[PDB]
Design a protein around this ligand. Sequence first.
Ligand SMILES: O=C(O)CC[C@@H](O)C(=O)O
Ligand SMILES: [Mn+2]
Length: 228
Amino acid sequence: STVPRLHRPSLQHFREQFLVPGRPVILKGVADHWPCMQKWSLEYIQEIAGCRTVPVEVGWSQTLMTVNEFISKYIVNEPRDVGYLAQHQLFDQIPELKQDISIPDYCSLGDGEEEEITINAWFGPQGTISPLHQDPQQNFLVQVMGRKYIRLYSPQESGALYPHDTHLLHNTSQVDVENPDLEKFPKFAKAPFLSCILSPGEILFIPVKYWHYVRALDLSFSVSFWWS
Ligand SMILES: O=C(O)CC[C@@H](O)C(=O)O
Ligand SMILES: [Mn+2]
């Protein structure tokens, strides 16, 4: 089934129908006119951030390079491998970029402090994949550039997703969502899910502990807000 799209729902409607029961939704008309949506070209990113060091996931290895090197090696030049500037607090590192985003007003429905909201950048070429995993906070995933295919499985379905047994990976499924090994993981086939293609200006609410799998369909930039 599809994730529902709602235009600027009230705080109360969002709280009652989505946050408290733990149901995903796409919020429209919320982030669509943030400055990032028109300002963040590759060239702008190079101008503001190009000389700064970022962590880059390659493949599986973790390396460090400048933003300029990342763009040259993994985005613009026929790249040899997939590289992803994933899960990085770029906005703490480069505070000028905070001017181009906002914290969604819905985060004020949580029990946590605004100071403790973690804002991560996710910037990479077409074809980056984040395997199916769950996170311990609520998330608003804001799509700025490009589109992502997203699959969502409820925490009720965790038995059918065969989480890894190691503590480093217990929040991650052993299954490759788009090419599952049903001989090894047969319960996966019948597990229900939601999916969407998340486009620029749209926000995906991923409830706490909802399993999510993400594949970039174009050159992509997303901003996540982890909150409670
Ligand atoms: O966009 C991605 O590739 C994954 C993002 C996601 O896991 C998150 O927690 O925001
Ligand atoms: Mn995540």
